């Protein structure tokens, strides 16, 4: 099409929309034309959208409360600190609502979202005598949109689902969008006064109860979920570098994974 120009020509939208078509350095567009053979012969699938990836579940948070109020639509990620000073752990992570998941990691690239989500729960202990888990829609206007041990004893007539840790083993829930608006804000700010009525997120949380002393919570997008308005790379650190221990202090960072959770 021409390698160079007098003035800007490679414009952000024009390229993505296919109106600006850069030339291959070899002059033969065939050299960068899609070839389907590789995925068919080597991979066995071909991923086309992050919409597919966020439907895969990942672990978000570990609770040590038998009955918990949990901020369903809070997509924030941990605060991180780094140091190369002697004898101090190199990396430290301090979560608010949980650790990063495919849902919150992909979400951090966008400003908005809409649609429902799914919840998965692994029990630390499947107690035979009291095997049930209840996940209830929690709507008290007074509650802050944060994690808190359940102290309520008056939330009658809620929407409840029951799963059995002994006969099944993992609890599976689907949460409707149930929003007062059609466009929510990813990691909207939660405040002291706030309560559970802000229009920036569905005014709905989870109340999770079981007889297991610990539970591992995970989530993913429901089938009607979407992220919108791409912003760019979110602030991030190398996940592999979390094993760093060059300061002489042993690495102490630990993400919520099944192996970390199930074994001590």
């Amino acid at each position: 099409v021409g390698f160079a120009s007098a003035g800007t020509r490679d414009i952000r939208s024009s390229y993505v929309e296919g109106k600006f078509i850069p030339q291959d350095i070899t002059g033969m567009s065939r050299n960068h034309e899609l070839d389907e053979q590789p995925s068919q012969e080597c991979i066995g699938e071909r991923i086309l959208s992050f919409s597919e990836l966020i439907k895969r579940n990942s672990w978000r948070y570990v609770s040590d409360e038998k009955s918990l109020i949990y901020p369903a639509y809070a997509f924030d990620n941990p605060a991180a600190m780094y140091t190369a000073a002697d004898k101090l752990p190199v990396w430290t992570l301090t979560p608010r609502s949980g650790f990063p998941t495919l849902l919150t990691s992909i979400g951090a690239m966008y400003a908005f979202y809409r649609g429902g989500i799914r919840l998965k729960i692994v029990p630390g202990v499947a107690d035979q005598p009291k095997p049930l888990v209840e996940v209830a829609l929690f709507t008290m206007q007074d509650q802050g949109y944060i994690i808190k041990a359940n102290d309520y004893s008056t939330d009658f007539c809620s929407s409840n689902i029951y799963e059995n840790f002994v006969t099944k083993g993992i609890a599976e829930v689907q949460t409707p969008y149930y929003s007062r608006v059609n466009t929510s804000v990813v990691s909207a700010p939660v405040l002291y006064n706030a309560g559970n009525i802000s229009p920036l997120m569905p005014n709905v949380m989870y109340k999770i109860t079981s007889n297991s002393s610990n539970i591992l919570l995970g989530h993913s997008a429901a089938d009607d979920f979407r992220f919108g308005f791409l912003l760019g790379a979110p602030l991030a650190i190398s996940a592999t570098a979390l094993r760093d221990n060059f300061t002489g202090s042993s690495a102490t960072v630990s993400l919520p994974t099944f192996s970390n959770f199930y074994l001590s």
Binding site: G7, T8, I11, F112, V181, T183, S184, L231, G232, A233
Partner: protein, 85 residues
Amino acid sequence: DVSNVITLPHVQLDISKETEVLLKIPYVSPFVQYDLVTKFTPWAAFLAHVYAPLNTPSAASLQVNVFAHFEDIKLGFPTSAIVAQ
């Protein structure tokens, strides 16, 4: 990092080639219209950052001017509420 500005919807200005550059942004927000009464929440911000420094043989400065206007306008409902300062 200007790299995080370049991934956003944006347009670039080369002062030796273009005289002016325009960016149009549609209204997008959890609120269907901007609240003139409580001012609760400006729907966007336009920013201009230096991508490559003003490069001249000796110290110099230029004025970067901004013109703006609304389009695809949708009005709210008649009220006695004050348009907040």
